[PDB]
Scaffold this active site. Sequence first.
Site, PDB file in Angstrom:
ATOM      1  N   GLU A   3      -0.372  -1.315  -4.878  1.00 44.79           N
ATOM      2  CA  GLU A   3      -1.560  -0.485  -4.989  1.00 44.79           C
ATOM      3  C   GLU A   3      -1.119   0.955  -5.183  1.00 44.79           C
ATOM      4  O   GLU A   3      -0.407   1.513  -4.340  1.00 44.79           O
ATOM      5  CB  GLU A   3      -2.449  -0.624  -3.756  1.00 44.79           C
ATOM      6  CG  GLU A   3      -3.128  -1.974  -3.668  1.00 44.79           C
ATOM      7  CD  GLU A   3      -3.527  -2.341  -2.258  1.00 44.79           C
ATOM      8  OE1 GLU A   3      -4.640  -1.960  -1.834  1.00 44.79           O
ATOM      9  OE2 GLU A   3      -2.730  -3.017  -1.574  1.00 44.79           O
ATOM     10  N   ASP A  42       0.828  -1.196   0.000  1.00 45.27           N
ATOM     11  CA  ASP A  42       0.000   0.000   0.000  1.00 45.27           C
ATOM     12  C   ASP A  42       0.866   1.252   0.000  1.00 45.27           C
ATOM     13  O   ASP A  42       1.914   1.288   0.648  1.00 45.27           O
ATOM     14  CB  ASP A  42      -0.931   0.022   1.213  1.00 45.27           C
ATOM     15  CG  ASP A  42      -2.062   1.013   1.057  1.00 45.27           C
ATOM     16  OD1 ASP A  42      -2.811   0.912   0.066  1.00 45.27           O
ATOM     17  OD2 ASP A  42      -2.209   1.895   1.925  1.00 45.27           O
TER      18      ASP A  42
END
Lengths: 458, 200
Positions: free
Chosen positions: B198, B128
């Site tokens: 991501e 992330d």
Amino acid sequence: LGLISGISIIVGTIIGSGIFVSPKSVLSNTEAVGPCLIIWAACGVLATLGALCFAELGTMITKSGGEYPYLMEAYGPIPAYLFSWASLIVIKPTSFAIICLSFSEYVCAPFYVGCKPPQIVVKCLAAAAILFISTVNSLSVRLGSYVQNIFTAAKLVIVAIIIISGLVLLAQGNTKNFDNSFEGAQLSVGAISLAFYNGLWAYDGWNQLNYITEELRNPYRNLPLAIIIGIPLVTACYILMNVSYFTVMTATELLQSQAVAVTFGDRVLYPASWIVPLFVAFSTIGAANGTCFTAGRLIYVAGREGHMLKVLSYISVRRLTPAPAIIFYGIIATIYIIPGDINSLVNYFSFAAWLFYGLTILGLIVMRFTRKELERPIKVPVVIPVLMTLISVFLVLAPIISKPTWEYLYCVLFILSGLLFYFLFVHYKFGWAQKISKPITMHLQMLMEVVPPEEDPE
Amino acid sequence: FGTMEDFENLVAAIHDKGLKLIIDFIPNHTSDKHIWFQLSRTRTGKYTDYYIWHDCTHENGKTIPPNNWLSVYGNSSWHFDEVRNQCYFHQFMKEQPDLNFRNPDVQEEIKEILRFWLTKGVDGFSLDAVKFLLEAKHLRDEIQVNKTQIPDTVTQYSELYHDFTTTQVGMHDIVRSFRQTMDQYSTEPGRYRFMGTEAY
Ligand SMILES: CCCCCCCCCCCCCCCCCC(=O)OC[C@H](COP(=O)(O)O)OC(=O)CCCCCCCCCCCCCCCCC
Ligand SMILES: CCCCCCCCCCCCCCCCCC(=O)OC[C@H](COP(=O)(O)O)OC(=O)CCCCCCCCCCCCCCCCC
Ligand SMILES: *[C@@H]1O[C@H](CO)[C@@H](O[C@@H]2O[C@H](CO)[C@@H](O)[C@H](O)[C@H]2NC(C)=O)[C@H](O)[C@H]1NC(C)=O
Ligand SMILES: *[C@@H]1O[C@H](CO)[C@@H](O[C@@H]2O[C@H](CO)[C@@H](O)[C@H](O)[C@H]2NC(C)=O)[C@H](O)[C@H]1NC(C)=O
Ligand SMILES: NC(=[NH2+])NCCC[C@H](N)C(=O)O
Ligand SMILES: [Ca+2]
């Protein structure tokens, strides 16, 4: 041969390609780790109680062959003929097909790393091993025995690597796969019976122990002492290798594994993982090269009674090898691998072999009521061939009443097809019978340059 | 969610059914209650440069930040710490101080966390906020989308071009070194380790 060197021939014959192939299908039938190790110990008890029954018959009768002179003395010529027929077309070519298929599972598997190799590569590499071993053993009678000493040496190196590396990792605390060993199992007489088929394939070779180990310094004591020491030493190596598998593998990872030893050698020996597909492949064609040495010993004595074609067990004049018997075993072995499938050739081999294992051991109990005055030097307690007979009834009837598959029908229809040939060529000596066989014997003789073996019985 | 034994029973149960498990991984920032940050703001040992600290002029309860950089959720991305008496950087909230990935001690600590979960048997990771990992060390002001806007009113994240705080030179090399760490657990066949990123 002494006692200690008599153990060396028993261990070196029994330990073969079976421990590298069978652990997946013993676990697949009894689906826990706990009962899987009970089965590998109970087949070591059946193999030693079976080899003690054969050691009694082998010093009682003293005629060469296999089970063939033991079945002739007990029942007559009908189950003796059916043994030489079922070992010609069923037992001996399927043994050669399972081993050469086991060689090909280990050559192909390192090239398909996370993947399953297609069946055309497994079968057309196993077919090239059947033809290559049949060509070498039909030309070079001494070459097969010189390379056999470096195949036995490569066999027990990779056995000692797996056993020792499993004891080191079990010492460091890798015991979490043995935690609840008896949760999830089968008390089914079709699943227990098929775990005994694949477990006893790795113990196969206990019935050929009689003849080449009569050359001892004191038989009738050193032969039954080599069985109580030799085969439970193999049982100690087979349990320890299966314990060594479950220290690096879950029971689920072992079922989803092509070759069980290349999976072990990828988790333990990383920068040199290729020595496991190299030594197991050397150990496997050493197990296939050994069976082609004794090709023709049972063929010769069954042909002496008129129970087998005599064009087999002829010897080539150049290159004094039993070339008709070796070529015949290679043809039936390549036919068996086209339908193929280890776990279908193992059930097909084990149904025919244990039908005749339980007929000679029952013949031991018949020859105590019918054949006294017979000078038994080795004598077993009578409860040993009784339970070995009842276990052989369990290993024959339970697969066909629980999980009847199609290979148990072709195995019956090939054995009883020999029962028709007994009544047309042995029982009723028809006139048109030897009008066929001696034309084939004469023309095959000039085609291969093979003569009758310049050899009487002894 | 449970204990560590609950996680280990879940990983074993996922593997007996033939499934694989990947988990999220947060490399960009920690909580301000992490033990590294409590050692960083007291200048204890090697932890002094674990986070990005700069001098500021906090008086009358209000901070004059070192530049105009804004948080994603929108106000200044610099927060004054009373113990350290400096300002620290945060991309998201003031409770989430950013790690200093120009410090090689920080890059070694992230690799030990990856090896921790790969040893537990996790089959892979979802990374992330990788585009927020590095910022410009020259600390120059971002360009406003509206150049005649008075800079006292530039408080929303969409009012700046983020040329200096997202996707800097050297960020992709940090992601490639994460892939190299996971390659030492991927050598056994059938046990490849997945890495997904991501960036929205
Ligand atoms: C589809 C199901 C059925 C399939 C049947 C397939 C049959 C294929 C047969 C192929 C035979 C291959 C033989 C070559 C093997 C070489 C191995 C070797 O190294 O030899 C060393 C050996 C050494 O000889 P040297 O080179 O002379 O020293 O070489 C040979 O002996 C080659 C001689 C060829 C032997 C062919 C035997 C064929 C027998 C066919 C007889 C059929 C009679 C049927 C009558 C029916 C009446 C009802
Ligand atoms: C080199 C390899 C090939 C050489 C060996 C095979 C020879 C080719 C001929 C094949 C058979 C030809 C018809 C039978 C001729 C003999 C009949 C006779 O009268 O016997 C007298 C014969 C005595 O003949 P004598 O040896 O001349 O005294 O009596 C018997 O031996 C009874 C036992 C017969 C055993 C038959 C063996 C048949 C082998 C082929 C089986 C084919 C199925 C393979 C499995 C299915 C596929 C998986
Ligand atoms: C930072 O953003 C916050 C928004 O959460 C601002 O704080 C309050 O926002 C509400 C609206 O939800 C207003 O009603 C309050 O008046 C705001 N507080 C103050 C003190 O004005 C805040 O103004 C922004 N700026 C700073 C410097 O904190
Ligand atoms: C944003 O940019 C605009 C021009 O690009 C600035 O000026 C305003 O533009 C509108 C256009 O319709 C006029 O109606 C206003 O009178 C302009 N002046 C103002 C709002 O003072 C504008 O100032 C810039 N800043 C903001 C915060 O909107
Ligand atoms: N006569 C034979 N070679 N029979 C097959 C023996 C198989 C051997 N016991 C193994 O472990 O694979
Ligand atoms: Ca950052």
